[PDB]
Amino acid sequence: MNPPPPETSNPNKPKRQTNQLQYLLRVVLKTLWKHQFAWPFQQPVDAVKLNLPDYYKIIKTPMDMGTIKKRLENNYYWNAQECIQDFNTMFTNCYIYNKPGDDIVLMAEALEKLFLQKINELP
Numbered sequence: 001m002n003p004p005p006p007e008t009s010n011p012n013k014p015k016r017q018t019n020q021l022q023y024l025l026r027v028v029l030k031t032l033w034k035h036q037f038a039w040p041f042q043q044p045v046d047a048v049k050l051n052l053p054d055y056y057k058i059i060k061t062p063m064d065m066g067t068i069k070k071r072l073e074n075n076y077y078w079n080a081q082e083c084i085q086d087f088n089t090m091f092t093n094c095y096i097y098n099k100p101g102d103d104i105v106l107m108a109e110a111l112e113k114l115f116l117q118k119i120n121e122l123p
């Protein structure tokens with residue numbers, strides 16, 4: 001069975017909308033979102049649909065761009081580093097569960113390259 005998704009709403013969190021966090025939503029996430037290989041990462045891994053009954057038995061901190069987008073829209077992050085950490089968790093989860101050369105890994109690799117290019121310079 002699928003776990004509940006990561007939390008995206010928490011009114012008790014200390015909240016900020018920095019220039020970098022606005023940029024991470026308006027520019028970085030929304031550009032990655034339109035990439036041709038973004039679709040597998042636009043929502044939590046559906047282990048039931050994808051017949052990956054061991055996915056959430058190996059991956060303990062799931063992450064996806066749908067969750068990141070919801071977090072950014074809720075000002076869930078205090079700084080850009082917290083949000084960048086979620087992107088890196090998303091890519092790293094993919095590389096952990098899969099193997100070099102798998103289609104999903106090539107797709108994550110492409111998105112990661114673009115992600116690193118877009119975050120090289122923040123406001």
Ligand SMILES: Cc1nn(C)c(C)c1-c1cccc(-c2ccnc3nc[nH]c23)c1F
Binds near residue numbers: 040094097098
């Ligand atoms: C690419 C691809 N090719 N095929 C044969 C399948 C079933 C896929 C695929 C479709 C949808 C999501 C995912 C996926 C997303 C994030 N992480 C994953 N880890 C393993 N699958 C993951 C996916 F790989």
